[PDB]
Symmetry: C4
């Protein structure tokens, strides 16, 4: 067996040490643009998010309304794939054609036709039928959804997409937690790679499957491999820190450690736009939230079902969260995510102080 020198850590175990803040760095001047899909050295990504936040590929998070609301603020949602091909394609189509008027019976993220961008999750099983349907519906990007992306099944899925669509259809893959996993999916052709196993808030109320790694350590390790890969091939593959974001400052940390964007479930589940029921229990307005591994999810094993405090509209909450991220970025002397990734000073905190 192979062992490691240091134990893995979570975001709660880190803090940022300030760098030189210039008179020109104020929250409003901070640019949160970030690449979504791979590109070559010197190029720009074909798809750039205006804010580094994407909603989780979950039934209780990314429905049509969430996708529209998030795209309006500059991010993108990945419509859940744990539903019928027809049902998921309908949501994608609804998002792509939302601005239409008569239909035959500032930071918005849109395509060349001013239509909101939207992503869609796929699986390694029915892709031969699901992918064409999502492509037809107008999906802007796809992502293989899995608890263990270090699999030949993902390579096969990406291969089929490349053979049928070449590099015209974008597809992310995951999840992985180390350089080996990243490298495998990179060579397989993934446009972006998702990082994270066992770090989601859903795991708080469930038992360990035995596989996983502290989210912070996973991002740091994968990012190092991604940078090495860039140096060897000239190909820059964006990576996504998926899960484990508990507080707003965790967002800044994930980005500082090298993640290009962040995927969140619980964070968005709390909003009015999530596709779940708003329930009031003893004066407390809550929203439903369950894992994709729960029996409640897959039936169209693991299992986690819970409630999250209602937070209102997505817009006001994201604005507040990102204002804090931008302010912290200025503390670190960064006006952009790439500058933050270059200048960030990250310290581990003692367990005693926690």
């Amino acid at each position: 067996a192979k062992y490691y020198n240091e134990p893995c850590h979570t975001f709660n175990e880190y803090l940022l040490i300030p760098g030189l803040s210039t008179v020109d760095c104020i929250p409003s001047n901070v640019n949160l643009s970030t690449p979504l899909v791979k590109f070559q050295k010197g190029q720009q990504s074909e798809i750039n998010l205006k804010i580094p936040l994407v909603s989780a590929i979950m039934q209780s998070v990314s429905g049509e309304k969430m996708a529209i609301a998030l795209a309006r603020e500059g991010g993108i949602s990945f419509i859940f794939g744990s539903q019928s091909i027809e049902s998921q394609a309908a949501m994608v189509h609804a998002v792509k054609n939302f601005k239409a008027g008569f239909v035959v019976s500032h930071n918005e993220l849109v395509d060349s036709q001013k239509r909101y961008l939207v992503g869609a999750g796929i699986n390694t099983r029915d892709f031969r039928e699901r992918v064409p349907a999502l492509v037809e519906a107008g999906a802007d990007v796809l992502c293989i959804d899995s608890s263990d992306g270090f699999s030949e099944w993902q390579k096969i899925t990406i291969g089929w997409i490349r053979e049928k669509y070449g590099d015209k259809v974008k597809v992310g893959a995951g999840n992985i937690v180390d350089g080996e996993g990243f490298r495998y999916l990179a060579d397989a052709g993934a446009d972006f790679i998702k990082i994270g196993i066992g770090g989601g808030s859903i795991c708080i109320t469930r038992e360990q499957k035995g596989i996983g790694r502290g989210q912070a350590t996973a991002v740091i390790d994968v990012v190092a491999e991604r940078n090495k890969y860039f140096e060897e091939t000239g190909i820059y593959i964006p990576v996504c820190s998926d899960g484990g974001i508990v507080y707003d400052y965790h967002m800044t940390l994930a980005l500082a450690m090298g993640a290009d964007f962040i995927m969140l479930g619980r964070y968005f589940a709390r909003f009015e736009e999530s596709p779940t029921r708003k329930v009031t229990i003893n004066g407390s307005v809550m929203k439903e939230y369950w894992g994709e591994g729960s029996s409640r999810a897959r039936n169209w094993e693991e299992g986690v079902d819970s409630y999250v405090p209602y937070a209102g509209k997505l817009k006001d909450n994201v604005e507040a969260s990102l204002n804090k991220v931008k302010s912290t970025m200025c503390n670190c002397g960064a006006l952009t995510i790439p500058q933050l990734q270059s200048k960030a000073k990250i310290t581990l905190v003692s367990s005693v102080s926690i």
Copy 2:
């Protein structure tokens, strides 16, 4: 005094990092066969379990019914030796002759005569009389039961067995927690060595005797010594991780760290087949469970007596546990235990994340 560079750790402090999962690895194709007794390089063990689980040498765990139920699923039970020679021999005989019809007044683990295999615990005191009786009764393997197997008494016991039966009678020894202890029992002639002191769940409700070591560290250290021993002598001695299994994923970890099989007490005590009373307390069906060191056990000092939640039939529970182990093995890219031991990537987790 001799000190160590790193502190010892328990199973809860580890997680497995996924490896490449091939299209051919599905739970049903995973082989959990494993050697029980020592053999030379290139040989196969004379006794191979079909599943890597054996029940503890305890009054509250391994009785006749447990032995039959576990053997039926591919494992083996070690009938407790903390009872009269006559009483223990009777249980062994009952297991060996269970399939008999008229008696004169798929994954089953059996001998050449299709009789379920069964083991029996012995002590370093009355072995001259207990061993012959167990051999006559048909015991397939014996194991010296002790909290500290690094003892001349164990060497003497194994020696007497070798002098009387040669290598025709198999006998495990233990418990030890480091290379020195392993080496001593290996040179003494033990067929398999049990690892673990102070890691049993029984210790949760009792005070430390002062001796012990984190179960994970103990297995890792002993396994390293065992592999070194194999390289020097060509003799492969199976080792058993005894105690400390709290969750199913701990089983996968123990195996990944090098243990050939696992001994459990609490896990099996919960089943209908354990020899203890099923008691209902306030709507909760429980089963009794007490340590062999408790005054309640030895009287035919330490002391631990408690209850464990009823889990029903052994069969359904083991199937569920092993299905999870096999699934995790596929995440790690392993179709067998030896392949897992070779490919496993094991990371320590921070105390903060725990």
Copy 3:
């Protein structure tokens, strides 16, 4: 990104190991004098506190009465700047002219005219108007108050002061937590540098902003840079450990680690002289205490409002605290703060023992 070899620690994680105590070291012979502003090798600071304690630049701590009471015991207060220029200048003037008799409508810290010394906090925004007013009022020293002093805004503020007053007006700067930050403010011209971000007791009831560092690690790191700076330039810049003092022995630790003086908020908020209301809740006399980042403070975001147990007069409490500090200093073989900083033996304690 830049990472660190060791995690940061708080004061609770340290203890002092005794050194040789001489017959001449008794609490009463211990000298707690300490420099407040920078000086060259071989010189004495133009301003020396008689005790190493200064009260925080907070609305709920440093008002006129606090400033008089603390100066009487040998320390100095920094009148809060989160109020109108006119209001703050009035408090400064009131302190400077407290001993006056007819006014036209042993360890005391005083100026050449026997007037109590007093400091005043300033900000990087209205200094062009606030500074002249404070200077006119008689402020003896100023200090830029900020959660992140590693800023060009602080350099600009110090620059303006130097251009207008040369080295005749003393001004501290902060806060910083590492050598880089210290170095920046040192080169900018600061007379003393304050250390500490996120370590204040106020943070106990609030969420992390994402920036910070264990107070002990921050002091140790900054002190090392300060000593290096002294060796390179011959300039000795006093540093202040700001926040995180929970127990009296933390004072001794901060000083032993190299801090010349200590800034405290909660400690002084408990006294009769703090400018907040004394409220009795269920038989418990308390005093109000809120952070400068709370909405309650700035309105003339973050937010922390709470109560601290009443402790009575500042005099008796400081005497008791310092008697303990002096006794511990004698345990360490030190009769002065500089001797303590040279002889102190500081050990980290295990999280288990905590």
Copy 4:
């Protein structure tokens, strides 16, 4: 300031790993004799305890009855010195002349006249008068009682004793927690050195004074210095682990780490023979226990007053404790304390497993 590479640890953070147990090692054959005062290489100590336990120099622990009861079992008590010279001398005399019949108005520890041995605590202040009185009363050994023995006052006290009595009067000194402190008292002439600051159970209900060190680390460090000192001078100075013994196995650990004997307060306070009142609170028989630093103690600052569960007669409790120590010693392959100190394998345990 001077810092250390590793944090200090307590006894709870350690466990012993078994060594080879020989057929000749059974509890009854284990010899717990141990030296009390210094001797040269090749010699035997002039005073050897029959068991390695001594009672604390406390008002609530070591009175006349305790001294007699402990001496009867082979240990020695140090009559508290926090009382009048006349009062303390009376207790010493009472112990020395307990076996007398008409008075003019197996493992027992005795002198050449069959009189129970007894020690007495002294202070660095009134020794010129207290020492002669204790010597006259028949005290067999003295010990300077202090929270910080790294003091010129202790050197002066030992010096006065040597000048007046030469090496005919034995006197221990302490407390210290590192090699420097040990070395100072060794060169000063101490017959034995006590280790421990802040590790006593009394500290559980009180605030840190700021000085101290984990008890285990303190013993290990001092023992290393003591062994180095022995190699350089040929003088063997016994050391005493004072305080921090919570469980019986802590005794074995302290001895294994190199301490020759152990001083305990709480342990003995629970017995019928302690000089405090036996009080029954709600069906629970308790005994009083307070620190020597409490105002309740010195008045003939710190302060700790509490209750300990009644345990009955000293005899039965010590026998049980030592039976466990001896059994563990056999697990480690040791028949004597020196053999244990040579063969012991000591591992640190993870904070997670604790």
